[PDB]
Amino acid sequence: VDMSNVVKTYDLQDGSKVHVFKDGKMGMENKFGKSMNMPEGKVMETRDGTKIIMKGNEIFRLDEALRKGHSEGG
Ligand SMILES: [Cu+]
């Protein structure tokens, strides 16, 4: 995914990378930006030792943006 809509990205001990966008929703991906899908209940520990659980509010928030990406006025 793009890193234009992201505001915070954590590096995961798993080797993946979560791009948390400005809305507060986080797009689960790998550090290369290849779509990596994750269900709810998964513990993502950052390089800080910060445990962030993929919840039903965070699992699929990514694909919807990938369906377009230019104008979008509603
Ligand atoms: Cu995740």
Kindly give the distance from the C-alpha atom of residue 19 to the centroid of ligand 1, in angstroms, as a whole number. 10
Domain of residue 29: give its range: 1-74
User: Hey, which residues does 17 pair with through a beta bridge?
Assistant: 11, 29
The H or E element that residue 64 is part of is: helix 63-66
Kindly give the distance from the C-alpha atom of residue 69 to the centroid of ligand 1, in angstroms, as a whole number. 23
Kindly give the distance from the C-alpha atom of residue 41 to the centroid of ligand 1, in angstroms, as a whole number. 9
Q: Which residues contact 4 (CB under 8 A, 6 or more apart)?
A: none
Kindly give the distance from the C-alpha atom of residue 13 to the centroid of ligand 1, in angstroms, as a whole number. 12
User: Which residue has 């990406």 as its token pair?
Assistant: 69
Kindly give the distance from the C-alpha atom of residue 71 to the centroid of ligand 1, in angstroms, as a whole number. 28
CATH value at residue 36: 2.40.10.300
Looking at the structure of the chain, the number of domains it has is 1
Asked how this structure was determined, the answer is NMR
SS (H, E, C) 6-39: EEEEEEECCCEEEEEECCCCEEEEECCCCECCCC
